[PDB]
């Protein structure tokens, strides 16, 4: 069968499986890529937390937290604590356009996890709160 | 005077005006299958007329129909309903790989 | 005028759904409406989660009621539906079949000069 | 928040190629205008400024589309010289 | 009994053809530049067609060919112009060679 | 002509007497407003 980039829809009968688990059962790696920090949490399909790592918890401080290599290190740390709990395949949900948006996913792979999907959940208000005024630089 | 002189009349070879795919059809907010053909599969964003090929009148009806259907409980806002992903692709937009 | 009531009902068994429709159609008649037809669009998953009357809903029964009523009945009916606990979401619109579609010859081109001038 | 998850803005990875999956997602969000929308939303753009930029963006597209049409039309004669020496 | 111009024009093949779009016409190659064939088909302007890949050597000066016409004169008016820009050539698609 | 057409339709209009029968007659049926359009302007009715 040809490859579909569209995820399997829950309730339909798909043939795709990962270690005998359906798409709806794969744990989720939630990456919050901010401009000055990156936070990574791996949770189960039932919303059970399994591992958490951020650049701040990995000994990065101030502007060093807002780097790709800092997020990559946080991903490796979250992968290690998650792999101990039985995680191999993860669904990645990244919100934000920070520097650790892509690098945080690299660290998850180097840590022994297999990414089966990528989801963006960057909050976009449909009209929402007034942002801060423009900067004069 | 002269029989061979040109005669005044309307262009007999004139071709009909172009029509959008929905010209002459009623656009109902309950017809979510039709409306879903004009929104992004991944983001639910309504396509501009340069992608849908619709005229101003039908582009407006589709937009108003989508907005009505969304908030009345007939259509999702943030994504195209997956049931309608295999419908005819009438939009000039290429996405995947 | 002629109106169309788009009615989403709480997912219930056949007996309670019929009682809700009867109770809803009788409310229309009590306000002077002449009910023309009742159409079942089927039970389906909602496009998103809807909270109504201290409950969360993921499925609903979609119904249509075509009816004529005085202009003052719409305001009273909208208020009636807001208090019925078995109604998830109800909207009253002017019936689409009343609006007659005007004929279109086609797509007349727009002069480019007007675009930048405008 | 009330919609189903893992449908919107979701791309599946093929053969472990996460870089190509990320590029496809970034292309999707770019084409739909989400990336530019997120960026413009970091600081409040004032209505007089938003209208001015939208007017500039719409007029630049027309001029670029019209200048492309002219170049395409006037490139038909780019063939070799048929009357060389005259 | 001298024929008038109005009479010549009414009964001319070019007048009788009507619109030129999607009309099959017979052309004659009069000038060739590498793989560019210059073909006159009875109109004001010639058309320029690239030598077909198959039987390219059969197309020589004087060879009569079949064309599908698109426009007798390629012209367009561009923004900010008072007149039309013309490239002084017709638009036609070369189908093949005419044989008896 | 519009009054005649309207006079026949009123025979099928819902009433307090026939309300229960029409309510049940609707729960058994299904009305589908869904259809799709093609690049050629042709309607593609649903597979039901
Ligand atoms: S072209 Fe006629 S309604 Fe769109």
UniProtKB/Swiss-Prot annotation, chain A:
Q: Kindly indicate whether the keyword Cell cycle belongs to this entry.
A: no
Write out the GO cellular component annotations.
Answer: mitochondrial inner membrane; mitochondrial small ribosomal subunit; mitochondrion
Q: What keywords are annotated for this sequence in UniProt? A: Mitochondrion, Ribonucleoprotein, Ribosomal protein, Transit peptide
Intracellular or extracellular location(s): Mitochondrion
Q: Is Transferase included in the keywords of this UniProt record? A: no
**Coiled-coil residue spans:** none
Q: Name one GO biological process term.
A: translation
Q: Where is it predominantly found? A: mitochondrion
**Tree of life domain:** Eukaryota
What Gene Ontology terms describe what this protein does at the molecular function level? Answer: RNA binding; structural constituent of ribosome
Similarity section: Belongs to the universal ribosomal protein uS11 family.
Share what the entry says about its subunit structure, partners included. Component of the mitochondrial small ribosomal subunit (mt-SSU). Mature mammalian 55S mitochondrial ribosomes consist of a small (28S) and a large (39S) subunit. The 28S small subunit contains a 12S ribosomal RNA (12S mt-rRNA) and 30 different proteins. The 39S large subunit contains a 16S rRNA (16S mt-rRNA), a copy of mitochondrial valine transfer RNA (mt-tRNA(Val)), which plays an integral structural role, and 52 different proteins.
- Kindly provide the name given to this protein in its UniProt entry: Small ribosomal subunit protein uS11m
What gene, per UniProt, encodes this protein? MRPS11
Q: Which residues of the full protein are shown?
A: 58 to 194 of 194
From Swiss-Prot, chain C:
Q: What is its main location?
A: mitochondrion
GO terms of biological process kind: mitochondrial translation; translation
Provide one Gene Ontology cellular component: small ribosomal subunit
Gene Ontology MF term list: small ribosomal subunit rRNA binding; structural constituent of ribosome
The record's listing under Gene3D superfamilies reads: 3.30.70.60
- Keyword set, alphabetical order: Mitochondrion, Ribonucleoprotein, Ribosomal protein
Q: What protein name applies here?
A: Small ribosomal subunit protein bS6m
From Swiss-Prot, chain D:
**Does the keyword field hold Metal-binding?**
no
Query: Keyword Transcription on this protein?
Result: no
* Record-linked Gene3D superfamilies: Ribosomal protein S8
Single GO cellular component annotation?
Answer: mitochondrion
The GO molecular function terms of this record are: RNA binding; structural constituent of ribosome
Q: Which domain of life is it from?
A: Eukaryota
Q: Where in the cell is it found?
A: Mitochondrion
Q: Which InterPro entries match?
A: Ribosomal_bS21 (IPR001911), Ribosomal_bS21_sf (IPR038380)
* Keywords noted in UniProt: Mitochondrion, Ribonucleoprotein, Ribosomal protein
Note the Pfam families from the entry.
Ribosomal_S21
GO annotation, biological process: mitochondrial translation; translation
What family is this protein classified in?
A: Belongs to the bacterial ribosomal protein bS21 family.
Q: What do we know about how this protein assembles, alone or with others? A: Component of the mitochondrial small ribosomal subunit (mt-SSU). Mature mammalian 55S mitochondrial ribosomes consist of a small (28S) and a large (39S) subunit. The 28S small subunit contains a 12S ribosomal RNA (12S mt-rRNA) and 30 different proteins. The 39S large subunit contains a 16S rRNA (16S mt-rRNA), a copy of mitochondrial valine transfer RNA (mt-tRNA(Val)), which plays an integral structural role, and 52 different proteins.
**Protein name as catalogued:** Small ribosomal subunit protein bS21m
Q: Which gene encodes it?
A: MRPS21
Curated annotation (Swiss-Prot), chain F:
What UniProt keywords apply to this chain's record, in alphabetical order?
A: Mitochondrion, Ribonucleoprotein, Ribosomal protein, Transit peptide
Domain of life from the UniProt record:
Eukaryota
What biological processes does GO assign it? Answer: mitochondrial translation
Q: Which cysteine-cysteine pairs are annotated as disulfide bonds in the entry?
A: none
* GO cellular component term, pick one: mitochondrial small ribosomal subunit
Main site of residence? mitochondrion
Q: Which GO terms describe its molecular function?
A: RNA binding
List the subcellular locations.
Mitochondrion
Q: How does it assemble?
A: Component of the mitochondrial small ribosomal subunit (mt-SSU). Mature mammalian 55S mitochondrial ribosomes consist of a small (28S) and a large (39S) subunit. The 28S small subunit contains a 12S ribosomal RNA (12S mt-rRNA) and 30 different proteins. The 39S large subunit contains a 16S rRNA (16S mt-rRNA), a copy of mitochondrial valine transfer RNA (mt-tRNA(Val)), which plays an integral structural role, and 52 different proteins.
> Which family does the record claim for this protein?
Belongs to the mitochondrion-specific ribosomal protein mS26 family.
Q: In its UniProt entry, what is this protein called?
A: Small ribosomal subunit protein mS26
Q: Which gene encodes it?
A: MRPS26
Report where the shown chain sits in the full-length sequence: first residue, last residue, total length.
Answer: 155 to 202 of 205
